Design a protein around this ligand. Structure first.
Ligand SMILES: Nc1ncnc2c1ncn2[C@@H]1O[C@H](COP(=O)(O)O)[C@@H](O)[C@H]1O
Ligand SMILES: Nc1ncnc2c1ncn2[C@@H]1O[C@H](COP(=O)(O)O)[C@@H](O)[C@H]1O
Ligand SMILES: [Mg+2]
Ligand SMILES: [Mg+2]
Ligand SMILES: [Mg+2]
Ligand SMILES: [Mg+2]
Ligand code: NA
Ligand code: NA
Ligand code: NA
Lengths: 227, 229
């Protein structure tokens, strides 16, 4: 039996930030895309080889926010994301603050529970970093009742256990292009990367949901990236 | 040269889908807000060529798009053009327009620099009065009581008439304007996010004149009369 029941809402998540973990980075952009499990189960199943890119579900909740960091972006981060401290501050973006936590809470509370965050490389990056950002706030984390999984492990199972010990790349773009023979769009933007992740999770939608139900773990158990 | 409420620092392009036309007493089924700082509009390339290319949206934007379970069914035409129905919103677990949505909207708005102005196509007769009606049902105070609002139909009418002198009858539907300016068909029409992006594009056509028109005509959302009781 499933450890936490059937997930009713999948929230595809991506973050951009000031740099890589050893720089103690800060979030500069956040996108959440909430999809009911029934929207995934209604995705058309693949049309041969290569299949077409699935279309996103009609009924979706989307939140995309730009966030001013308290430190400069690494050159490598600015180079790929198109974001910098100057871009964000000149356009009046606010810091990762209590009000943001409230916004996230109200967004989550509009989704049927339980919810599971899905992020590519989430276990090593997105989830620990979000935990760090939320832990330094006064508002309690709005995610302590939410679950999470890493889509890297999900797509590894769906690819390996369904079709050669050869290693495959599991970067977000490599997966997308391997499945659909097509280049992702708007790479290294929070929203663009979330839509790419949604497309690869729509590849085998019922298999993905089952794997998520089986591997969802509480977000509260995620260790912060740094203190 | 003396503005009514100062320079608008944030423009929030806004669109709603709903269950039908005003005579049906509609309820909102989808809401999208796209918040753009005024400097992103100041730094938009002006349109030259024929047709001009569709402007690039700003890199830095805040976006909120939410589907909402209505208390009444969509009209057949409304359901077809929007791709939404009451039954499907309910099986996908969408919640009604409620207090928590007002809290979400409030927190979203507070992340934007003030003063802040909603921009909606046909907002003065439809979106703003309908939102006022929806918010009036709630126990929470309106999260829009300090926000301003303008209708982009009037804006584009002013902008287009200034760009070709008088003395015919043109449609000012969202799609007609877009296709007139850019010789392109809009994408994702009659979806809240799609129409908000199309609205952004027409507002970027003459972005300095749009900002000036908005500064001159912004009025408090609190003054909007509800569509119905
Ligand atoms: N080469 C890189 N140099 C610096 N930061 C990077 C690099 N690759 C990824 N990142 C960081 O990781 C964040 C998330 O990556 P992604 O979701 O793949 O765009 C980015 O916003 C950057 O802060
Ligand atoms: N041609 C139309 N026929 C019926 N209803 C419409 C029509 N245009 C707009 N509406 C209604 O008004 C709402 C807002 O219009 P729009 O933003 O142009 O999609 C829609 O969701 C429908 O409920
Ligand atoms: Mg990522
Ligand atoms: Mg990314
Ligand atoms: Mg509209
Ligand atoms: Mg619309
Ligand atoms: Na923080
Ligand atoms: Na499947
Ligand atoms: Na202009």
């Amino acid at each position: 039996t499933l450890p936490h029941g059937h997930m009713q809402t999948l929230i595809f998540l991506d973050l951009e930030a000031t740099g890589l973990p050893s720089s103690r980075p800060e979030v500069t952009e956040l996108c959440l895309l909430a999809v009911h499990r029934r929207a995934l189960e209604n995705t058309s199943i693949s049309q041969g080889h290569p299949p077409p890119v699935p279309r996103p579900p009609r009924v979706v909740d989307k939140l995309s926010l730009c966030i001013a960091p308290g430190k400069a972006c690494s050159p490598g981060a600015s180079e790929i994301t198109g974001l910098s401290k100057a871009e964000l501050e000149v356009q009046g973006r606010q810091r990762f603050d209590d009000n943001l936590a409230i916004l996230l809470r109200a967004f989550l509370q509009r989704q049927p529970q339980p919810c599971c965050l899905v992020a590519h490389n989430g276990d090593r990056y997105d989830f620990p970093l979000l935990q760090t950002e939320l832990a330094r706030l006064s508002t309690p984390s709005p995610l302590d009742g939410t679950f999470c999984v890493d889509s890297i492990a999900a797509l590894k199972a769906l690819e390996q256990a369904s079709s050669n010990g050869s290693r495959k790349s599991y970067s977000l773009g490599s997966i997308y292009t391997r499945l659909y023979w097509q280049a992702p769009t708007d790479s290294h933007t929070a929203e663009g990367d979330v839509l790419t992740l949604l497309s690869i999770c729509q590849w085998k939608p019922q298999a993905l949901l089952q794997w998520v139900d089986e591997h969802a773990r509480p977000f509260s158990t995620v260790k912060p990236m740094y203190g």
